[model samples]
Target: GHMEDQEFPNAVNSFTPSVYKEVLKTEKANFLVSPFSAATLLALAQSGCRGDTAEEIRQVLHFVGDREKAEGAVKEVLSKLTNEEYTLHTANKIYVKTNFSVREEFQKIAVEVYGAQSENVDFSEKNDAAKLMNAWVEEQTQHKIQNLVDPEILNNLTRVVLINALYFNAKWLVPFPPFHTRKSDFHKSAKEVVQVDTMYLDEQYFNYYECHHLDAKLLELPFKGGASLTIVLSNQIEGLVSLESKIKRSFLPHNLTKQLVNVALPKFKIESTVDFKKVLKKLGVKKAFGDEADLSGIAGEKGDLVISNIVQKSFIDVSEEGVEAAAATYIPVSPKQFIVDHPFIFYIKVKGMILFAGRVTTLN
Candidate 1:
């Protein structure tokens, strides 16, 4: 496989499994995260960092090649993902305290490369600042992401606030039979079985694969637009732990062929708020958050600013009609099986980049 100038999307795809594992450790029930949003926001910060701070962020995000190439790849992917065919929205913004001045170079790169805008805000007015931030995020994510920034988190000392919001909604190209939806029992755990609204599709051709290496089955469901949702369901009822452990090292098999499969997927919704600071620390990003940080590129002074916090709030709803957070064909006599009656992992990929990754272990 020859590698094209796709290092940025490759990096985001590489970053997903490790971060997904760490986030799963904390939120074991049902959670969703936009890995592309996180990586791009961190890449934005990396652009402003100097010394080892930049290297740490770069390595953690798996960004290879030179700065120009990476930024070019990001810009290419961003432009393609925002096509008129899909209802996908991605936005980035920076709010800096009034006393601090952002470097013109950084501002230019943020706007021109990442499409991020910069603004001046006074953190002392915590309520107004938070309300403004929340409304912006809410609007970017179509009201699904609310109260993104807590009032208590902003204070007079806070210097810079960076935010990235991504929203995607699309209809399935071949939606499940609406009347076939039924109330089914979901295996939340070994002992806990809960009732859930399950949608079924009979003898439909799908992009399917049964991976003997990971002991899981992969299904690619296409949307009407350019994106697709990949569901990686473990073969065993309690095999999620094994699947997560193996997936980080071995990548998902890309050779998903067309096959007739009976699909049983539940209609579910998940809204989660992730604290990225802790996760970044665990992933070997240390100096950027501490006093020795050097984001001089952002504020034009070596000691002018340090990252205070990083948070991401995401939401997704899957129904018989379509997917709000986020989706191929075939035909054979005997269909294979794919019943998502237990815990599983999902990825929303657009233009060969993973925009969102999450898991569903429980209905509630």
Candidate 2:
């Protein structure tokens, strides 16, 4: 039986109902979508890595857009990255492999990319494997991300196994100056906002948008190709909650491709972090947690490991020179505007795939 059919078709659907729910939980003018693109290329010289590994890596390249075409666009971009050839000699030890999965729909997309045949290895038994995986993930992620698999949870499964590790790093074509940041208001709800030292700047030659009804503006910054990041801000102090709710209800992958109007945007820098394990479990992914879970394909029938944790750490600094943003999502964008004198949410995306999406409330 095809692994994808067995694990994804049924399990993902059963496991991630909240993916869309969480998106809808936010109010208008209160969110940002950030995505990171990582390319893991292994050198032919590395006896531990090979072309097959690259294929396996590609099998795990997954992204979900608001529309089929939007998803297809990301797949097309990933396809190009997969097909590119790199030079490797005994001394040439560089390799590239890229992997992507949406935090909202992780199981649904991950199952599709990795398939069932790809064994889920629990490296918790071998401290070295666990350490190696952690180090590789962290190093490739520029320390912004760490612990892809949970250590405590690995003690409960019996099929999955760990194999290769892939990582990618790309800085903004332009970076923001840290000193320009000032204290700004981040409205969390209609009644409350936080005072955050938000970053700000203004410049020409960038994509921008305005939501007249919500009294907000959206700014977009494009990556090398079609990928971009969008920041939505509300002029009202109470707009964040409405923005968050609307996002979950109306923010579909398909809505991303439409043409956006240009507008002057306010400059602001926001930061956030997320612990997705509980959220995933709340989404009904119990198999990855208990003794009944199966990962036998990875290490014979004796593999006893379960995913104990899934932690995501992200940081993005946006400004005029360009966007120095990095995270798990391959998609990139940095939108700027000046009317955002109130609270708002920020987003980073790769193509149409959303990697790190969150809300920030800066109100004093």
Candidate 3:
């Protein structure tokens, strides 16, 4: 039943846009999300779901409910992402009530397909449980993400907690000159502008594209390994609102050419924590949060077992030297130039899948 050839990457690519749209719907500040990490976590939770509960997750994540198929796809992608040039690591765990025991079949699949560990904790001791889970998350993410689980969110009825942590670090293949970076004006809005540290790369060959369809430009900055960072900048300073509404799977460009270009990108670090309980509901994953959720697959005989919450914390740092926390197309002659001094969209991608995605609306 092993699906050595699953379309997991495509599923994630499609899923990435929707998550970004949802996460950005209410806020207008700099934001980031590790969609790949989110997908793997939800799929692991799906392992203990049945009936409509499972179907909702499948519909939203674009992953089939079959354990072998979904998990195999994840396993394959995780293994293929290994390379010496960059570091991409992910960890998963299932924390269950001390008196509860998950189904053996589910546990086996968790270990085999997900490389996940199962631990038992006393949920009644809310503070202790949160401390332990947060400690694990902190270490897994290289201390980039901390206090992922808050004690106030857990209660006596909480039966199971599912967690996923991902860490990515890589150096840009063509690093920007440190001295060339200087304070520059960043247009926060049509009426508001501010100064920020911007990295400059002059007259270097890069994958560039001027997408007429979207009225935006695309730039591909490659890291030491197979992964790359794609930045999407709008034609107008006030065009982010319109450009965002139109983002979809097709909007991502595949035909990019290396051309001489000068890029002025800001250096900033962003750390984000998202609570998927509400976001998942908006994304059509309602049953998993409702009382009717059929999570009997985790703890036998259902009882009051239900997913309390799913949270993720992500961090990214871009600078002149390289990317520590952690595009395309064009031509020949005149060396096109663009400055990312306004709001823009960026995503870290490896193996044709989105590892991290976000929109930098302003500098802080």
Candidate 4:
């Protein structure tokens, strides 16, 4: 049941590398991605498609015969995440051009099945429409992400725009003390170092593991309930890539040897925006982008339904207080310092599902 129940997050996790690798090549930046958000939007869009277009989306997302299992798994996992234990919000919205005819059954699926709402907006009024969508994203993400859609992307040619936003705020199982935070030297590189306001993470209990195979140290800083933020700090600064290569689906909470330890990490915030046209092409999801796209299933109207662009934005703040979307360590009598002063890999898991994944190097 763990594997079957875990399919949705597994599919979402699969997208992280393909997309993140592209983000690295193009931008060379630090980023936090809501795989849940991106995959949910794509899944909802797939529900209203047919033939080659639908097949392309399904293949890219690793879908089976239909949508029930995929959609149900996402809902089941998210409902648990948003319980009183944490402040996690995620939703999907589809805005269509005014007077554009969409199939009623398709519209109902978006609303009833995915719990996404559908509305008609005047895409011809590009700036005004963009503001409405942008305002919605800001509210949904608690202002962590704003101006999600560029007005340039909105025009008469735009048929339907699908958007998803997520916001999370939760505390660690043991909160980091504000008093323990101090300015410490962060080794950005062998040639460059900077003094950062760091949080002292010396604690007694943690889910710790040794990745001797990959030469990394794994530490789990948990939330109030079952979800957690797992950090894998490579043994050597140059080992970041090699360490990440070993992160597989087999990488779940397993028989990890527990340790009591201390670690220090800088108070850092990261944000990124991605437009997925080129990236999707690289992933072999090509037909849905250009003239060859088939979308008769999206509507009864006599016209084409190719996607113009899918843009997403994400933000996260990590500090002594807690995490805010607009959105942890070993023990010891005297724990050894596992200072995260360089690049490392981070992942957020909710009930075995990967909600977010990221790699941070430069503070910027």
Candidate 5:
């Protein structure tokens, strides 16, 4: 846990629960979110916010409006996230209507602080604009993410859109033998169960943490390239909510030490799309989505580009060898998991920042 410059970690820690609580509210099936991707983009977006919108953003982000500190942290985090061993990339972009005017100050922060790119896209031409943004997302995520925006959200009134993309893949430090993978029963709930192919390992050396009070177990699975995915398994089928509550207070059990443990993990793939606008609103990010919103820092005093909707799409494939996961979040319309089996949380961290977080309930 000697991860440097805890900016990314702190951001992810605070923001994940804000969105995750909303996920459990509406979703019944599996769900996932890359809070880092969303938070990083919102940090860029919040830089230009004013008045109540800025106030709410500040409160939700747990920041006191420190712009320089925000940028330096992301910059440093990104530098350490890449290397020859693993593949991890994070990208951000601001897409604006051709006629929309943005303040130079905001553009400077997007570039200098967040390293985000700016593009002039005609939102009035919804089909073509969607194609362009989707193409950029695909490229940024190595084609793992596609068709990121809904043209329905893009129309005559659209102004500015913000986007964030994250992609990660790493080999296992110690691979589970494919031959050992077998079909097993995954209890979706106390009453329903499904037979699925799962990988098994006995007495594996890995970090272990358990909390009887919360009925949770945390296991760290290391990637060959140095990245790690930690699984938070609940003792009961419906214990995820209790485990998550503790997680929001403290990210995983940092107190746990390495030990030989038996693990039965499923080889599963999942895809999720979240109506992020609703989640932010549920968290009291109100002014930014409505006309009453004040974003004078971004579009200037004369500009009238209010955020419309925010959405995200994520995909993940985990197997005996490793993981291939990607996600892209776009703020359009002007914008703008786990688990072992049953229901659980997946926390993927790199250089101390959570890159991906997911809750899985089913293979189907």
Candidate 6:
């Protein structure tokens, strides 16, 4: 059954809540997860592939769980992809195709289970089967995601899969130039105020306040459509720690729509990655890695096939467009002008749709 976009009580309670949390954590470092990441993992998993191969799939699953971290993994995979003659790039978008022959029996099983079409299958002699398979996975993902599966990947006898994560971010509607962005003291604790580059933009926005012991403000930044990026700023620098502690107990998705007001935002982007197998294993999904696991839908092999690769890649380009300046007192910001000059967390959501989430700290 397809997962509906119904509103859940808590974000963490969803089918893959832990994965979602990890995705948000990645944003803290300015990394973006392509929307294709989740769609591909779920589709492939549903296709019935399991084991180490499944584990590989799960690793990518973990990487995409957080966009920033997924970028790191994507970079690593891109190197391998290029070495293998698979062209990829961080600019525009990328698509990859891989081809390989499984045992005839396995292929037969796959046809019956996954409804895989032979017409789409390539029989090219020069192409590596593994590469083709990877590409096929990207293609499969492209059906559900945008800006993924570059054209360079298609070939004969090749199974293709594509991943595309498109990000167009703009700074807060209010401007925060370099002069205004100063080394403000970030209070790590009551006794500490670490000097950090703080980008300030004060403006009237739909904001809200949470009645917790901590002094926190919830701010919203609307996107091109009805989509928005939400940020919760704590007056205390250690507020993140407290927020983390309460996430499991006090967090609720509905809280976002509960209030609105004026806000000041600090610009930043965060990126990072987490190993899915380790996290899943720790979360008690051991059966996914064992021989007894079932994934016959992928290639139709009995215990011979396991998930070998799971990878996700994402990119976000943020700038302003000056055209909006004439319409309202607020100048139309150029898509590229709003410089992200500080540390902050972000969320990309469309109404109730939590497409991608991540954060960014200082770059190391």
C-alpha lDDT score of every prediction, in listed order: 0.79, 0.37, 0.79, 0.70, 0.72, 0.39
Q: Rate residue 86 of model 4 by lDDT.
A: 71
In candidate 3, what are the lDDT values of residues 80-178, reduced to their tens digit?
677888877666787878786777877777777766766777889899999999998777766767787889989978777777666677878887776
Per-residue CA lDDT of model 6 for 213-262, tens digit only, reads: 54454555565435456555554554665554444322235454433243
Please give the clash total of every predicted structure, in order.
Answer: 5, 72, 7, 6, 7, 87
The count of residue-pair clashes in candidate 4 stands at 6
Candidate 2 shows a clash count of 72
Query: Candidate 4 lDDT, tens digit per residue, 1-364?
Result: 1234356666777776666666656666577777667776777777776677778888987765546676676556555767566766655687766775666776787665565666677888889999999898887766767888889988778877877666567777766766778887766567877777888767556777776677777777787767788887888866676755655522445555557778787777877777666667777677776777765666543246676667767766887656762214433347645778888878777777777777777763
Q: How much lDDT does candidate 1 score?
A: 0.79
Error of 1 at 189 (Å): 2.0
What TM-score does candidate 2 reach?
0.51
- Candidate 6 is scored at a TM of 0.54
Residue 78, candidate 3: C-alpha displacement in angstroms: 1.3
| TM-scores for candidates 1 onward, in order | 0.91, 0.51, 0.91, 0.88, 0.86, 0.54
Cα lDDT tens digits for candidate 1, 1-364: 1135365777788788878878877895888988788777788888888988888888888776488777876677766776555766665777777787777888888888776766767888899998898898877766777888888988767877777666677877778766778889889778889888899988888899878888888999888776888999888889988987786743454788989999999998888888788788898899888877888878857767887777777778898657773222323347899999999889898867888898888883
How far in Å is the alpha carbon of 139 misplaced in model 1?
Answer: 3.0
lDDT of 2 by residue, 93-120 (tens): 1111112111223223333332111212
**Which residue ranges in model 1 land beyond 4 Å of their true spot?**
1-5, 249-251, 325-333
Alpha-carbon RMSD to native, per candidate: 3.5, 11.4, 4.0, 3.7, 7.9, 11.5
In model 6, where is the ten-residue run with the lowest total lDDT? 319-328
